[model samples]
Every structure is written in structure tokens, then in C-alpha cells.
Target chain A: VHRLHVGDAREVLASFPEASVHLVVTSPPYWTLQLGHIEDYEAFLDELDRVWREVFRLLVPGGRLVIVVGDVAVARRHLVFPLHADIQVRCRKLGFDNLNPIIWHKHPYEPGAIIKTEIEYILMQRKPGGYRKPTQEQREKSRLPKEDFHRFFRQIWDDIPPFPLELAERLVRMFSFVGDVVLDPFAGTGTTLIAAARWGRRALGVELVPRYAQLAKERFAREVPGFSLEVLD
Target chain B: VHRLHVGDAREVLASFPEASVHLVVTSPPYWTHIEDYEAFLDELDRVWREVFRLLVPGGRLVIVVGDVAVGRHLVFPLHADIQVRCRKLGFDNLNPIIWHKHTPYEPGAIIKTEIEYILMQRKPGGYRKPTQEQREKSRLPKEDFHRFFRQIWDDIPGEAPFPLELAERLVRMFSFVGDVVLDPFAGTGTTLIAAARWGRRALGVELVPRYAQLAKERFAREVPGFSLEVLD
Candidate 1:
């Protein structure tokens, strides 16, 4: 099952039952770069925090949350602020254990900068309350393939570019098992939803911007095979 | 010039003048696998705190760390723990370079233990602006620069007296010729050797006197032209 909601993520998430999603994979818009508008940094963080709190409420006990974010700069000053670090701090405060962050190198290798922005941080966290050891039955059920397992935790993901599809597919395959629910709060292009559906998992998306929501729906319809999307107004 | 200091890293690091080194590259011992968890973290915290103070404005700290597995199930994320600590000290944490050490697979393991994290961080300010001569001298070939810029580095270490190749690459990438490179946990002086070979000064601090001696012997046999100074 796949569903898309065109509205604020906090509102859409409120309608879903608690402890529903198995994993979350999304890239929230960058700070101060949203639609070419210089949004207030603190205000942007506060809004994201609210949505994160909701995500905590909706995620299952052992569910993982993977956030894909890149660092930004202002006025040629590097280290403007590390969004990945802030997200880890916030989620840790919500009692999630920090998993090692994966570096997603989004651009081709470049040089001559004190600090380069070609890489993105794939911050992984797991909700703390769960069985430490999965039983044989559970292992078989959620077992990742040997090839993917070998490389998934390698810290650096250099093979993937900025394309949403490759990231979506890999996140879905590695984090969630078949029939698990994967949710994307800032679903820009519905790539996560389509990837989840294709990988035999249920997906839910909430896009706040109307145009991107429409684009997400259109992309899902045209791109995903045999999977239909239900959009909530 | 190459100097070897025989002491704990924290103490040795504190003895240095502030901002004396241009780059730091070291692989500290793993936790729990080496000592009690509390003791390990306490040592790491103090050592890194001192390392942060000793780094020059815009100097880089590159740490090669690997996660340790406890029992059959628990994989302790040491890289994240170190990253958090470094960030708390206001280090500008860059994306880490993943060292893909190609370990052979064990039969029953779900995930292959074939990776280490080369955590890269810099002081609060950006790196010092290199002069034209320094830039031209240290600039890597375009092909080498592009290949190395990728976060995942797929180079096998030369059989460990510390990974000589890894140390060489880090020395080349992060420091300039004539700059000083310090390795606090200078196991067998691989980093110091790499620094010397790359036309830079080297300082090594080793806690174990035997390894410190071993390092001196290696330097004598391998790099006879390099001058050595020993400090207690």
C-alpha cells in the first residue's frame, strides 16, 4: 500500500496511528535554501523538531530513522552548522541510539576548497526499546542480502550521485524488510514511496509544498509499475 | 626533523606548544577490546581534548577508527562516539573517509568486518590559505585528486607496522611540504616515516617504550638520512 498526502507533515502524521512505520528515509530541504527563500534557521529547526517528535511517536520500537542532509554555508564561511549533528542530538534526546552516519557523496569529486559540500550525511538512528538479539525466525524475515549487508554500513557511499531513485532504493532495501512500512515526511518527488512499493514494502509520504506534491503524484503514476498512489487532499 | 616522545598521548600532546603542528593522523586502540569501557572513554576524551587544543587554526585531525563487536550481536559504533566527542570540542567534522580493509569473510557472520572510518576534522577556522609555491608543490595530479576525493577509499594497508600506504595518503592529502605532522598514537612510526618521506617534519608519541624503540630501529634501517631526536 502507498499513500501521499499534500499538506503539512505534522498534520498528516497526526492522522496516522502511533508505532506504525518501520523506517523513515527522507531529505528535508536545506536551511535558508527553501524555495530560494532565506527562512529563519531557528524557526526552520523548530518546525523540523516538531515533525521529528511526531516521527518518534509513529515509529515502531526498533524502527530506524535515516535522514539524508548536507551541510551548508553562508558568506563563504564553512561549517555554517552541521544539520546531521543536530539531528543526532535531537533524536538521541528522544532516546534513539545513534548509529554510525553514512557519507553519501552526492557530487563528483572536486578540489580547491577549504571545505567541500559534495558529500551528504545519511544519519541513521534506531529507537532504543527493542530486542537486542533477533531470533532465527526474525533474522530470516528481515535478513539483508550478503552483498548489500557488506557495503551498507561502510560509512561512505560514493557510488550514488544526487539522483533520488538510487538512494531511495538502497535505503528501502537495506533498512526495511518486505511488508514493512517506510514513511517520508518531506517527500519531494515520491521516489521513496515508489521505491518502497517496488521493493514490496508499504510507503507513506507527506509533502508540504503543493507543486512538489503534484509532481510526486505524477512521477509515481508514470514511474512505478503496477503500484497506484492514493493522495489525501 | 623527526622526534619521538615516549609517554601517554594526552601528556605528550599537552607538552607541545599550541598550534605547533599542521596535521594529525593516528589510529587509537579500540575500546573494550583493549581495556574497560569507562577507562577507554576517559582516556580518549582527555587525549582528544588536548589534541584539539594543540592543533593549529585550520589544522586537520584525521582519526582511523574501527567498530568493535561485543559477543555475537553488539556492534559498538566507535566512529560515531569519537565524532560526537570531536564535535563537542568545536571541531569542524568533515565527511569521513571509509577505509575498506578487505578482510576475508567468516562463515556465519551476517556482515563482513571489512571497514574502518578515517574521521576527518578541522579546527574552528578553515585551513590556512596556502601560498602559491606551497599549493603548486603539494597539489596532487588531477586523476589522483579525483580518485582520492571519493569518500570510499579501497586501498589495502601494507602488512601492519601500521598501514604505511594509509599514512602516506593522509600525509599527502592533509599537509604541505615542510609542515609538521604529529601522530600521538604513533604505533611503529609509520605516520612519522610517511611525513619524512613526503618532505615534512614528524613527531611521534608512543606510550610503549618497546614500540618506540622499534620505531627508532625502523627509522635507522629504513630512513638513515632522516635525523632523529628522542624526548622523554
Candidate 2:
């Protein structure tokens, strides 16, 4: 059962039941505005925190929140803002224990004046409590081939390029079992949603920006064999 | 003059001129004497504070800090913490190079932290105006430019002691010939030697007497006839 909802994540998540989600794969909105100013960056962090606090409440024990984030490296300004590190620290404050961050290197690597941006951090925040218990059938269904297991578990993933679709596919399969629930709050264009769907897990996505929510449904039609998207406005 | 000082870094760094250093390549002591991690972070911050003062405009501070895997589930975000603290001290964040050492994957840990963070943050002011001769001398060969510029280096790993080859590579890449290179925590004095060999002025302060002595011996044996003033 995959669903897309058009509204702010915090607002939509407020309506969802507690201890519900099994896995959350999200990327916060881009580092917009003149956020290089410490105050401005702090404000941006505050906005992301609103949704994060909600995600914490919505997660079941042992559910993971995987954030796909890149440090903001502005060439003209001559700085790479440590956005991934800040998110890791902030989520820790909200009681998310950080796992080893997956360093995502861009394919055909781009070099800059002094080692400018060529990577994004895939930060894993495991909500501390009990472990997830799934049926043997579910385990068998979600079990990775040895090939995928070896490559996917590495601390640094150099294969993934500028974005995540295959990355999300690997993450969904690795973190959650089949018949499990995968939720994406900042689900821009529903990359995680499709990854979850192809992997046999039930998926849900909340996009505050409505056009993308509808576009995600369109993408669903284009890719998935099924066109049945029960989207909520 | 090449100099290696045997003393605390905080004091020795004070003796140096402000904005005189073109680059600082060093790693802090690993959770050394830390009951409170914040204390560990702050203690390192003092060295960084001192380093910030000595660096020239657009001087680079490259920190090579490795990940730990000791306890049942021990993964302290020390690298991230260091990066943040450095930013507060007027350093602009550049993309950190991940020194992938592979891992010693143990039981009871979900993901064994197999990589170290080689944080490369620039001191903000303006570009280092290198002279034409320096630029010509410091030009990176195409092969080296291709090898050194990438974000991930799987070439080597260490038990927190940076390899001499890695030190040499950084010194050549980030700094020009005849530029000043400072290593505040100069363990074994590898960075100092790398700077000296590459024609940059070498400066270092080692907190441990054993390592200070080791660096002194190594410098003499390797860079023979090059007098390194060992100061107390």
C-alpha cells in the first residue's frame, strides 16, 4: 500500500499514529537563502528540526532515519557549509544515535580549487531501543544477494553518482524487511517511495510542495507496473 | 630555519608570527585523557584556536582524524565535532577527504566505522598571493593532480599515525615551494620532514617527549646535513 500526501511533513505526520513507521529515508530541503550567516543557518536547522522531532515520535523502536545530505559548498562564497555534520549533531540531540555515515562520492568526480564538493553524506540515525522483529518469510523476502550485501555495507559508497534512486533502493532493502513500512517525510518527487515499492515494502510519502507530490504519482505510473496511487491532498 | 620544539603546543604556537603559516597539517591526540568528550573537544579546540591565528590568509588546516571501534557500540562523532568547532573559530568548511581504511568489524556493532575524516578547512581572508617562481615550482604534475585531488583515498590507512607518503602528498599539493608549513601535533615529525624535503619551511611542536625525540632522530637520519634546531 503506497500513498502520497501533499502537505507539510510536520503537519501530515501529526495526523499519523505514533510508533507507526518502520523506516524513514529523507533529505531535507536544499540549503536555501544566505544561510552562510551562522544565524541564518541556525534558522534553517530549526526548520528541519521541526520535521525531525515529529519523525522521532512517529518511528517504532529500532526504526532508522537515513538522511541523504550534502555539505553546502558555494564556490562564489568560497565555503562548504557542514550541513551533514550539523544534521547528525541535531538528530543526536533529539535522541538519534548516529551510525557510520555513508560517504557518497559523485561518479566521474569533480575537483575544485581545493578539494571542493564531490561527496554527500548518507547519515544513519538509529532510534535506540529494541531491535526490529520480522517473520522468517519477511526476512527471506528481503534478504540481499551476497553481491549486494558486500557492496552496500561499506562505509563509503563511490558507485552512486549525483543522486539517489539506486542508492535509495539499496538503503530500503538493507534497512527494512518486506511487508514493512517505509516513510519519507520530505519526499521530494518520491524517490524513496519508488525504491520501497520495487522492494515489496509498503511506502508512504509526504511532500509539502504539491507539484512534486503529483509528479511523484506520475513517476509512479511511468515506472511501476501498477498505476493505483491513493494520493491524499 | 627548520625548528622542532619539545613542549606544549599552546605555548610554542604563541612564539610564531601571526598569519605566517601557509598550511597546517596535523591530527589531534585520540580521546587522550578524556572522561568528558566535550573536554576533549575543547582541548583540541585550543590548539585549533592557536592554529587559526598563525595561518595566513586562505591558509589551509588539514586534519586527519581516524574513527574508533573499542566498546560494544562505540562510535563517537569526533570528526564531525572537530569540523564544527573549527568552523566556529573562523575557518571555512571545505569538503573533507575520507581516508578509507576499511574496518575491523567486531560483534555488537551495526556498522564498524572503517573510514577516517581528513578535514580540509580554509582560513578565510583572501587567496595566498604566491609569487610566479613559487607557482612554477609548486605546479602539480598531471598524474599527481589526478591522484591527489580526489575526495576518497584508499591508497593507505594508519593507526592514527599519518603515513610519510600521505604527509608529503599534502605538503606538495596544498602549499607552494618556499611556503611556511606548521604541524602543531607533529607526531614523529613526518609532516615537518615532508615540508622540508619539498622546499617549504618546516615548523613543529610535539607534546610527547618520546615522539619529539623520535622526530628529532628521524629528521637527522633522513634529511642528513640539514640542521633542525631542536628547541626546549
Candidate 3:
């Protein structure tokens, strides 16, 4: 298991060798915050363009990048419905095939001032198909699991219940073996690392805000015994 | 000439009496372009509802609204569809007055497209018989005046030379002189300028503060004959 390093991932990716990480997943900042100083929607696209280039460079061939992002409401007045459209366009520009949009409706579904309905899109992209594939026998067994032959594949999804922290941990533990590394770029409140640590998997995270980073480290330490936390310089 | 007042016209129209205005001229907002249509018909349905309530009996309402599409998604032809909705809401359907702006437009761009329909509707009652004294005033010949109340206007001018002027022309052709001209969504005080210049009372409302200030200033200095006052 690799020790988790802390720093802005865009700069950190430059330090690591090409194709270092297996899986990368994180929820980035919502651009159009109510505060006046936050970057305008146009400037937000420019920033995303820069950050995505670094992410594309850091991924291994056939490695997955899962980004969770929600819409932004500016001035408590206007809602830009094309929040997903902007990110999708950027991801396309970065040379990525966009997988299905995973809708994560965070609990307490009613709309509010700060966290209105908690709708986020989980955009997955692959680095080209050069790596080894899971055997056809293994794929078939997973796809047509003995008990669940009645379930069919679908495109537009509405009913996947949210895995808020406790459920997220259980799923990670059940799916991944021990010592596997999990990555979250934004690492909000260290939820992903908390899940990873509880599941006996090595957790790596990058956070922009320092106060949130400290809070994340403290949260992980309290939850997982002998959890190592480091703030990236 | 009529002036354009750009904003929600429901409150703006309150200043006028129930059935005093001659012509209600405007291209009301579209349903999808301005906002979500689930509850708000963009801006069209809001103002059209108010417009129908305020127009006097036997008065005319003329609107040139254009339809827009978001990529391949058919969001309905705005003018025709809204006309049907307006008819259901107690507006008498008159003639479909098509005003094709002869300016060239990029084929793919709907953001600033030009083809628009000038819809006309008549009120239920209240019109005076022309007195012998007033009939003499009509002896003078003018190119703009039409013979019938139900006239399809094809020779409309563009906004480049004058948008407000074109509105005023439409008002004069369809209505009586000194009649109040209501143009909701009066952008840059164009309709107000035309109204004041030609002799008509105008009211404007704007959502954007910056544009409102600009319109107020332009209306004060550019529009002659009316005292501009900010009434709460």
C-alpha cells in the first residue's frame, strides 16, 4: 500500500511518474457560489480546463477518473441548468469518452438555501483501452450474477440510493480487497478517505482548503486506528 | 409612438385605466429562453395574462413574437403556440400579421434570429361613432393609415434605423392619436422615445438595474414632451 501524500493534485501529479494511479475519484468545487469574488462561469471553465489536463496526464492507461460535481446558484437568484453541460464540454475537450452520468441525490431530498436537493453528476472517463481486461468468464459471472438475472441494463437511471458515508464504507469494503488505494481529489470532510480507511484500504486525498484539510485529518484519525494524515506542502 | 418597457409588465400596466390604451404592441418574452417553462412560461405567459386583463373593449393588441429552438429539442413555435394560449385566455383572434425583418441572419443561430409574427386581438366592446367634427380631421391623407381594423402588416421597419419608431408606426396605424401605447419590456427606452416624440404616454419597467438607469436617462433627455418621474 502506498502512503497518502498531501498537496494540490495538479502540482503533485507533475512530481509523480506517468501513469502512477489506478483509480481517481473526487467531487470538485461548485464554481458559481453566491459570494461575489468566486470566479464567473466563464472563468470557471478556464480553471477546469487547466486542472483536467493535469488529471489526464496522471492517470494510467485504462485507469478511471470519477468526478462528482453539483450545480451552483449565484446571488440566490439564478440557476444555471447547464452546469453539467459545461463540465461535459470540458471533459470532451480533454479527450475523454464520457460514461453515464451517475446521479447522487444526497439525503433530505427537499431543496434548501445552501444545499438545494443535493444533485451531483458522477462523470467517469477512461484513459484509452490498452490495459488488460478482466477475463470473459469473470465478466459474465458479474454481469449475470446467479441470483439477479431479472435485472436489466439501462441508460437513464433514477433509482440508485445514495451511499452517504456509512453505506459508502460498506460498499468499498465489499468491493475492494485490503491494501488497495483509493483517491479523492477534493476530499470534502475526508468522507472518501474515511470510507477507505474503515475498509482497510490505503486512502490518498488532495484538498485545496487548509482548514478543511485539518478537519479531514482529525476526522479520519478519530475514525480509523493508526490512520496516517499529512498536509501537502 | 409607443415605448418599450422591458421587465415584468404586470406591475407596469397598473398605471393605466382598464380600457384606455389604443394599441398594446410588444413581442413578449419567450417561455424557454429566459427561464424554466415548468412554472414560468419564460416571460410570455406572465405579461400576456396581464395584457389581456388590462386592454379595453374594442381595443387592439399587436405582438410580434418569434420562436426559438434549443438544438434539436422542439420547444414549440413560440408565437403561434402562445397565440393559441392567449385565445383560450379571452383574446379574440384577429389576423396573423407577419413582420419579416429583411436583415440577413446566420442560418444556425436562433439566439438573434429575425422572423417574427405580429398578432392582433380585439376587445369585447366600447367604441364611439365618429362625430362630423372628428370626421373632418380624417380627410388628411397619410401613407401609414389602413382601411380595415383587421390589417396584416408586412411593411414593418427594423430596429437598426429605429425599433421604437416601427412600434410607434404600428400603434398609429392600428389606434387613435393621443391613445396610450403600452410596450412592456421597453429596452433602452426605444418605445418610450417613440411614444413621447410622436405624442403618447408611456410606462416602462426593467429587471436589470443598469439597463433601467440607462433607459431612464435616455427617456429623460432623448424623449421630448413628457415629464419623466420615478413613481416608487
Candidate 4:
């Protein structure tokens, strides 16, 4: 389960077995900026929807999927498009139960539009059933600490900040049992996998950009000591 | 002839001659959490259409508005909606200036998003670029032109009082000496004061009587060689 596949996510996700992934944590590309020659807004949403359909098919019952996205402005007419709303609608159509979004507040100095993009939406959705009535062993391993329980469940999570490491660690601990598999389809820089490995959970990622995938591999080698990632060619 | 008219901007703007004013600087109300959605937008549409008719060929329209929440669940993008409306009236869309509203926190939503939008639009069929003689006479300071053209400004206009420095900066860059500048929703006459300081003719339309009186009082006290005239 600890592996990275360097390919298109929709294609790679088909190879993943049903009920294999316990949780998904990923940030899909925003439509405002050009990503892989995709400039048209509607087309970008369509492509993203295709990938989420695969995510829906692969996640186990009661599995959680967290998507991080923000609103963006179109410079031509000073238009602010709420991309997060679009994602919510798409995920709901695919039978995922929409949950309250976790607001990840960024530092003010972070470069962005006139609004000074201080917040990113961490949308959490569940796949129907409640955690399969966790086994006695799973129950013991996955119980969140009292401090974390009070803090993590809040609607706004400003203290954690929006770095990859913090987001991955928090969600991994909250959603999945130790040794359970976590999958990130749009795995940019492999932060999810590294966090999963650090916390004794298995991880699988599919990254489209070759440079990011290479960087992710390098991070695992250097940042997480004694960790080796299996490449799924 | 500089004057102040106390009335709705849409009705007041219609009394002006065709293609008269050179520049417009005003901030209209936002359509955030308002109950009558259709009526609000209709009013905006009327005001902008009249503005289009009153401006001379190649005149500029600068509006400061912000995006706001319509309800608990939805966010209404007012800046974007106004842009679309203005464009439909044959105004060439220009680079929109971003006004950073530095508020620490908002009570309603879980997330705090704070920013205002200043949209710059021009009458269609490009204005005659200033000739060498004209440029020399009316050009803005080189440093000012460079800074103002960047499209993002950290300026706050809390409530009805438009920031004096921002108003002056935009007036200097967009209009020339003796040219006419108009503010339809003239709150305290900040735009008129900016125009007068830069030696341009100015007019204002204010709905509130007290604010109109405040603007008259401020102009008479502050602006050198200033004269005030009231129009119905």
C-alpha cells in the first residue's frame, strides 16, 4: 500500500480495488489558473469530477475524503468564482455525504488576490456507513486524545496552518486506524504518504507531474529517515 | 460649472448633457444579504446605463464595490455582477484595482474573507492618446503612474468616507486639468475634493441631505478658490 504511481489519476485509480482506501486527502488544482493546458473553467471542473467519481468507487464504507480548495478571481472582469461550491455539488452527486468544511486560515502575507486569500476550504465527505463498528484492536489504536478531540472538531482550524505536513498528520490520525491505507490521487510532493508512514499508516499516491513525483520521492528519502517508497510504474 | 444635486444618481445623471463628464469616481452600495435582489440589480443597471450616456467618448468609470454574503450559505459576487452589467453597456473593461480592506475578523461565517474591488471601465472606441503638448501639460507624475497602474492597493474606505489619498491618486492618473469629474453617490464629496485639488471641474449627486451639507462645508473650508452651487 505504500507506493506512488506517476500517471493520470483517473487511469491509475481504476487499478485500485474497491474498499481498499480508508481515507483520501488531496488538493485538486484550482480552475482559475492554467493546469496542464486546461484554461477553460468548466472543462477543469469536468476533469476533476471524473477523478472524484473514481475516488468514490474506491473508498471503503464509512471512509472519509478531504478536498482542499479556495475561491479564485478572474482578472478579466474582476470576477470571484466560488470553486469550493462547485466541488461540493460534484461530490454530493456522486453519493458522498457532505460534511462541514474545516477552514484552514493562511498567513496574511501569503501572495493572493485583493481579498488576501486567508482561508482554504478543507471539505470532508463520508461514504455512507459509520466506520464499520471498529474492531477492538482498531478502536484502541485510533482513539483521538482529549486535547485533539476538542481542538480538531472545531469548524475553524486556524492554529494548524495550511502546510502539507500538519494537514496530513491531523486528518490521518482523526480518520484512519494505524496500518490502514490512505490514498491521495493528486499527490503533489508526497506529503500525505510521508505523514502516513510517520504515523504507522500505509499510503498510496498518484502524481501526474513528473517533477513533483521526483521531489516527493526525494523528500521520503531525506526528510523521513529510513523510509523507501515503492514506485508503481 | 461645479454643483451638487441631492437625488437618486440614476435620475440626476439623466439631466446632464450627452458625453459631458471626463471621469466618474463613485462607490455604489453592495447587493449583499438584501431581500429584493431583482430591484437592487435593476437600480444598478439603470444608474450604469445613464453613466454610460453622460460620459464623453473614451471617458473612464471607476467604481469601488465589494463582494458580500447574500445568506448564511451563499456569497454574492457583487463586483463581478457590476462588471458584467457595465460591459454590456459598451464600456471597455480595463484592469480592475483591488482595494485591500484590512479587517481582522468577521462574525458571520467560519472563514474571514476581507477585500474590496475598484473596477476601471472606459467608454468604447479608445480615447485619443494625449499628444506630446497635452501629455506635457496634464501627465501624472512618473512615480504616481507607475504605482497606481499596479492594480492592487492597500487602502481602506470605511463606511461612507472614501480615502482622500486614494481618490487623489486615481483622479491624477485618469483625468486632466479643467476636465470634468463626477461622483454619483458622493459621500462627503471626497472625489470632488480630489478633483478640485488637481484643478479639475467637479460635480456630485448625493441622496442624503446631511452628507451633502457636510460635503459643502468641507469643500468651502478646505479647497482654495472653491465655490459651491446647489442644484435640485
Q: Pick by DockQ: which candidate is best?
A: 2
Give the distance in Å from residue B2's predicted Cα in candidate 3 to where it truly belongs.
Answer: 31
Candidate 4: clashing pairs of residues: none
Sorted into a CAPRI-style docking class, model 4 comes out as incorrect
- Residue B26 error, candidate 3, Å: 26
**For residues B1-232, what per-residue lDDT tens digits would candidate 2 score against the true structure?**
8998888888889888898889999888774613587787888899898889999988889999875544224356778888888878888888888887764111112655778888887888877677888878888878878888878888876642688878888888789888888998887898899898888999999888888888888987777568566787
lDDT of 4 by residue, A148-196 (tens): 7656665556686425697788878777778788899988888988888
Off by over 4 Å in 2: A34-36, A108-112, B31-35, B70-74, B103-109, B157-160
In Å, residue B10's CA in model 1 sits off its true spot by 2.6
Lowest lDDT block of 10, candidate 4 chain B: B103-112
Tens digits of per-residue lDDT for model 1 on A123-180?
A: 7777756623435554475666677666665656777752478788888877777777
Candidate 4 TM-score to native: 0.57
> Cα RMSD (Å) per model?
5.4, 3.2, 20.0, 8.7
Let me know the DockQ for model 3. 0.02
Q: Residue A208 of candidate 4: its Cα lDDT?
A: 90
**With candidate 1 superimposed using the best TM-score fit, by how many Å does residue B14's alpha carbon deviate from the native?**
2.2
Report the Cα lDDT for residue A40, model 4.
63
Sorting all predicted structures by lDDT, with the top scorer first, yields 2, 1, 4, 3
Docking level for model 2? acceptable
TM-score for each of the candidates? 0.78, 0.92, 0.42, 0.57
* lDDT tens per residue, model 1, B57-168: 8888888887664522335566666776776677876767767776322112334355687888788665476667777778888787866666667766525325777888
User: What C-alpha lDDT values do all the predictions have?
Assistant: 0.74, 0.80, 0.53, 0.72
Rate residue B167 of model 1 by lDDT.
Answer: 85
Q: Which regions of candidate 1 deviate over 4 angstroms?
A: A10-15, A33-50, A73-77, A80-82, A85-90, A97-105, A108-118, A128-163, A225-227, B31-43, B69-74, B103-113, B124-150, B158-162
